[PDB]
Amino acid sequence: KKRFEVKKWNAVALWAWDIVVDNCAICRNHIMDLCIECQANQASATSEECTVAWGVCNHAFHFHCISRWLKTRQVCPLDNREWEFQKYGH
């Protein structure tokens, strides 16, 4: 019937999470806020700016929260494996 008919298609795709990150699971605050401890004490430090820190597992906590957590424990809060910095920035 049709002049040209397609019989086989071999596509390639890329799956990604719909929400990259929506909450810092340490202070329970949102990613763009000032990490709770650095929220109440609104003076400086925000200069350093609570830029998020991405681990190897790509979990993306606040840098203040993850650094404060790393002082005693060396395990990621969620997957409970070794924590290793991989990325830093927005």
Partner 1 sequence: MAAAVRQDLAQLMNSSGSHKDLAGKYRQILEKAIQLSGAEQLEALKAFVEAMVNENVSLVISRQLLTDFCTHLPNLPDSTAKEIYHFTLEKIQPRVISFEEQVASIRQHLASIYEKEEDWRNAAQVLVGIPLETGQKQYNVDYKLETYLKIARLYLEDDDPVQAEAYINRASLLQNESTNEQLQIHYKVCYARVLDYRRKFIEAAQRYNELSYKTIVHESERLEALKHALHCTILASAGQQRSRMLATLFKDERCQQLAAYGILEKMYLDR
Partner 2 sequence: NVDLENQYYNSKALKEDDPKAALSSFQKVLELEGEKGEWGFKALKQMIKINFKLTNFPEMMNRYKQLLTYIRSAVTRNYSEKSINSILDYISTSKQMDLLQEFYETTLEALKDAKNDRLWFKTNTKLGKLYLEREEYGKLQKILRQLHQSCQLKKGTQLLEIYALEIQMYTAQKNNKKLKALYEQSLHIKSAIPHPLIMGVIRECGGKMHLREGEFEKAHTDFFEAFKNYDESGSPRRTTCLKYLVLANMLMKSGINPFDSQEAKPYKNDPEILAMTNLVSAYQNNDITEFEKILKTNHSNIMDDPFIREHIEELLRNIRTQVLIKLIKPYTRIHIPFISKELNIDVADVESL
Partner 3 sequence: KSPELLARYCDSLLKKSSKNPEEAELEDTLNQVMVVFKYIEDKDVFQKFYAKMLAKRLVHQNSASDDAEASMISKLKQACGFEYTSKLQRMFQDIGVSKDLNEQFKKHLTNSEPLDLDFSIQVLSSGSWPFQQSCTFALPSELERSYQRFTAFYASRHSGRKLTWLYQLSKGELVTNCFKNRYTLQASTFQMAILLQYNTEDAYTVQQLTDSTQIKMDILAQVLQILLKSKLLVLEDENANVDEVELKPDTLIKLYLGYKNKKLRVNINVPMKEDRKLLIQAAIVRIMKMRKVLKHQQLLGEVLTQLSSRFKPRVPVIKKCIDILIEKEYLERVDGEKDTYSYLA
Instruction: Write down the residue that tokens 């990150």 correspond to.
Output: 21
31 binds partner 1 (CB under 8 A): yes
14 binds partner 2 (CB under 8 A): no
Distance CA 61, CA 53 (A): 6
Closest residue to Zn ion, based on beta-carbon distance: 38
Binding annotation for Zn(2+): 24, 27, 35, 38, 50, 57, 59, 62, 64-65, 76, 79
* Residues engaged in binding partner 2 (CB under 8 A): 17-23, 25-26, 28, 58-59, 77-81
